């Protein structure tokens, strides 16, 4: 019924497609789509401590993919640790890019 269960694992197209320079100042200011991250601390007995390949990013969701399953964890329900394209670990609260990926690409509210 959902694409997730269909696009699970093809991290391949997320590989030979996702190579933007990953960086904190570039993590919440980037397109969450293929960047690799893990759910270290969350409020969900079934998503804490797990690692997946990011896929979805909307006003109410942030998805990661691994094996034959997906990482369903909103941005405000957990902390995402995406790895820097420089082999550097990024520690950022999914709350910064909470729902609005634009806010970062378009900077804070316009006023």
Partner 1 sequence: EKKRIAKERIDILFSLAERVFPYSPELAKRYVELALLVQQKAKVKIPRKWKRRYCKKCHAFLVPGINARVRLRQKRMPHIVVKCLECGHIMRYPYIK
Place of tokens 């998503």: 47
Question: Site residues for partner 1, window 42-101 (CB under 8 A)?
Answer: 55-58, 101
What's the chain's Rg over C-alpha atoms? 13
CA-based angle 99:83:10, to the nearest 5?
Answer: 75
Query: Which one of 26, 51, 69, 99 is in contact with partner 1 (CB under 8 A)?
Result: 26
The secondary element (H helix, E strand) that includes residue 72 is strand 69-72
Please report whether residue 29 would count as binding partner 1 according to CB under 8 A: yes
**Interface residue list for partner 1 (CB under 8 A):** 2-3, 6-7, 10, 13-14, 16-21, 25-26, 29-31, 33-34, 55-58, 101-102, 105-107
């Amino acid at each position: 019924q959902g694409s997730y269960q269909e696009i699970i694992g093809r991290t391949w197209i997320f590989r030979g497609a996702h190579r933007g320079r990953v960086n904190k100042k570039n993590i919440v200011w980037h397109e969450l789509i293929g960047l690799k991250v893990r759910v270290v601390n969350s409020t969900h007995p079934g998503y804490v401590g797990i690692e997946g390949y990011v896929i979805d990013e909307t006003r109410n969701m942030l998805v990661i993919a691994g094996e034959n399953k997906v990482w369903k964890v909103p941005k405000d329900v957990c902390i995402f640790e995406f790895e820097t394209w420089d082999g550097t670990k990024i520690k950022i609260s999914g709350e910064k890019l909470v729902g609005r990926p634009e806010m970062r690409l378009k900077k804070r509210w316009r006023k």
